């Protein structure tokens, strides 16, 4: 079967800046006929994936035509000329000329965009999750960037490290930032021995934490 | 259109619903041609390592195609697309023992914009659908990847609007969990 390469996993650019992924199939996708069966898609977070080129270079209906792809008989380029923010996603090369189909491995764009500190807020738990016994604290660092980021919880001033979980998103489609959300769970009786609760962000952007912190005896 | 989610228990088999193409994506992975087949002639063509995996056994009556899986290993969880170039919706195969659990959903009230949230949380298998006001508020909005926790996910969302309009013009986090066939629509209201 036919082998498709992507040598990079990822490509980054500035918004409003030209970028290309390159592919690569072991075979010629040329066709006696003259056509060169070779796919482009797009695929975001959560989508199916989404044709922008087929037949090697042909612009998808309803894809915008900054979209082009180029190439030789096994050497294919996708051109995104004054990328977007909703450009942001994974895109494959798809040869379909023999059976097998397969595809390449795929290449994450990667916006590059000014440094920005995170939004955090910080959430006690619902009257309902107490009603069932639970007690979850929700903090979001929102529309941060880089992606690296930091988060600490404070229980009564003692930090604490078990019963936190975070997710972080893909990056944002509208600005280029990032968002991550940390949980600490603890169970209602827990949660009633303690008054402070505590989220510490600490971001590239600066050297002192963001800080967010409410008192169940507020 | 392809159902939301199949919970089969390891071992079970799968019958899934839709020139018919398949591929097959594990979370956070790529794609693979799993094979096409064609209603016509019920003329079926596998890809090798899935010919002894799968079935593309059409049906005229329903004017749908199917794909059916025989014994599943958590190496057969994964995302499910039956296209046309006309994409399916997938469906999210997850081979695993546990039974289905519909979340529980709590609202995320605080204490010039303002942040709510929605945590979804205590439920098997993935996937979760969530929106805010039927999807009319979508430009504030970011949802959180579920973490896998004691054989349970735990999903959260934000949404973050001008401050003057909440609670005045009401905020509503909707989760369908395809799995259990449940919805839970949660306006969010002041503490």
């Known amino acids: 079967e036919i082998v498709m390469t992507q040598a990079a996993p990822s490509v980054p650019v500035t918004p409003g800046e030209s970028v290309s992924i390159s592919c690569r199939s072991s075979?010629?996708?040329?066709?006696?006929?003259?056509?060169?069966?070779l796919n482009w898609f797009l695929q975001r977070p959560g989508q199916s994936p989404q044709l922008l080129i087929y037949?090697?270079?042909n612009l998808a209906s309803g894809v915008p035509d900054r979209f082009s792809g180029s190439g030789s008989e096994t050497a294919f380029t996708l051109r995104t000329s004054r990328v977007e923010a909703e450009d942001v996603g994974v895109y494959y090369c798809?040869?379909?000329?023999?059976?097998?189909?397969?595809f390449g491995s795929g290449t994450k764009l990667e916006l590059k965009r000014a440094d920005a500190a995170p939004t955090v807020s910080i959430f006690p738990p619902s009257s309902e999750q107490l009603t069932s016994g639970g007690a979850s604290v929700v903090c979001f660092l929102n529309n941060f960037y880089p992606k690296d980021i930091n988060v600490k919880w404070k229980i009564d001033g003692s930090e604490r490290q078990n019963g936190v979980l975070n997710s972080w998103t893909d990056q944002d489609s509208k600005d280029s930032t990032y968002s991550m959300s940390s949980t600490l769970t603890l169970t209602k009786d827990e949660y009633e021995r303690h008054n402070s609760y505590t989220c510490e962000a600490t971001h590239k952007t600066s050297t002192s934490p963001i800080v967010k912190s409410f008192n169940r005896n507020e | 259109q392809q159902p939301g989610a199949e919970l089969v228990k390891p071992g079970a088999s799968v019958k899934l619903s839709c020139?018919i193409n398949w591929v097959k994506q594990r979370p956070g992975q790529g794609l693979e041609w799993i094979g096409n087949?064609?209603?016509?002639?019920?003329?079926?063509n596998y890809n090798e390592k899935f010919k002894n995996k799968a079935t593309l056994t059409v049906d005229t009556s329903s004017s749908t195609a199917y794909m059916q899986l025989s014994s599943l290993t958590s190496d057969d969880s994964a995302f499910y697309y039956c296209?046309?170039?006309?994409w399916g919706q997938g469906t999210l195969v997850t081979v695993s023992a546990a039974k289905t659990t519909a979340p529980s959903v709590y609202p995320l009230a605080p204490v010039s914009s303002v942040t709510l949230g929605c945590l979804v949380k205590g439920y098997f298998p993935e996937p979760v659908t969530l929106t805010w006001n039927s999807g009319s508020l979508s430009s504030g909005v970011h949802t959180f990847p579920a973490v896998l926790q004691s054989d349970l996910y735990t999903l959260s969302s934000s949404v973050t609007v001008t401050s003057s309009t909440w609670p005045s013009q009401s905020i509503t986090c909707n989760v369908a969990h395809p799995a259990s066939s449940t919805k839970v629509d949660k306006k969010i209201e002041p503490r």
């Open positions: 296209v046309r170039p006309y």
């Open positions: 087949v064609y209603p016509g002639s019920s003329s079926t």
């Open positions: 798809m040869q379909h000329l023999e059976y097998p189909f397969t």
């Open positions: 020139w």
């Open positions: 075979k010629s996708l040329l066709h006696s006929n003259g056509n060169t069966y």
């Open positions: 037949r090697m270079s």
